[PDB]
């Protein structure tokens, strides 16, 4: 019941919105997981690990160069926006809206969301292997050596770029090798971030889950902490609810969400 939900919405003073790949998918962004998500011969799980980078940093960067560039043509969809405008509108009323996202495509920012927590990091940040510095970066290409590389055709030739010529740290005294500031498989989340998110979910009086499910990581870490306080939770995804069955609005976020937040 939508009207029931809006009645909550009305009251809410601290709203938290958790977002999964459903929403980045709706903007036409590859997640490279499950059927027909390949990049050349591989899937994410193969390449998004520290072992792969250690072993073959050109190839991993080729992969991430691609993902960086495909973004130039993918725009935020209506869900992205509806949220961003929501935050803005409510901000002005002294209410609060915070986004917690597992996505790394920066689409929330491009839609104009401000209080965003990127818990898997971002494609457009680099961390230095040497000095550990995190710096924004949207350069295209990120470095010359990679220009027009990362083609996804299964029979593409490896670039096999010398590690010295991949993206390096600019502090000169440093010149460390950069990696994407993304959480890979087998890595821990940043605790500073998680402590924040915790604080935010402890304060929230309404929680949305969008393009993923409360039941699965990462929603699962938290929705429990909020639900157990008795706070309403509203899913917006395309997963199915069985006949006999807090709120759940089946359908593409692009469609379901903006009416909800109006």
């Amino acid at each position: 019941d939508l009207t029931a939900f809006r009645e909550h919405f009305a009251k809410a003073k601290h709203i938290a919105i958790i977002t999964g790949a459903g929403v980045s998918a709706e903007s036409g962004v590859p997640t490279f997981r499950g059927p027909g998500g390949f990049w050349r011969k591989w899937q994410a799980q193969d390449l998004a690990t520290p072992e792969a980078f250690s072993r073959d940093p050109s190839l991993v960067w080729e992969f991430y160069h691609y993902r960086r560039e495909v973004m130039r043509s993918k725009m935020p969809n209506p869900a992205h926006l509806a949220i961003a405008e929501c935050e803005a509108r409510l901000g002005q009323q002294g209410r609060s809206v915070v986004i917690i996202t597992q996505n790394i495509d920066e689409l929330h920012h491009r839609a104009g969301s401000k209080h965003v927590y990127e818990i898997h990091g971002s494609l457009f940040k680099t961390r230095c292997m040497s000095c550990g510095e995190v710096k924004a970066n949207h350069k295209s290409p990120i470095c010359p050596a990679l220009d027009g590389k990362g083609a996804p055709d299964p029979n593409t030739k490896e670039a096999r770029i010398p590690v010295e010529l991949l993206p390096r740290c600019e502090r000169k005294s440093c010149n460390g090798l950069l990696r994407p500031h993304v959480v890979w498989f087998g890595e821990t989340l940043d605790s500073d971030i998680l402590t924040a998110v915790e604080r935010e979910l402890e304060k929230c009086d309404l929680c949305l889950v969008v393009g993923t499910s409360s039941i699965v990581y990462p929603a699962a870490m938290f929705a429990p902490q909020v639900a157990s306080r008795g706070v309403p939770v509203a899913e917006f995804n395309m997963e199915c609810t069985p006949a006999t069955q807090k709120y759940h609005f089946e359908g593409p976020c692009g469609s379901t969400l903006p009416p909800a937040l109006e």
Binding site: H120, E187, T188, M221
Partner: peptide, 8 residues
């Protein structure tokens, strides 16, 4: 620290 996707 939390393994991502719970290590799975």
């Amino acid at each position: 620290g939390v393994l991502k996707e719970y290590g799975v």
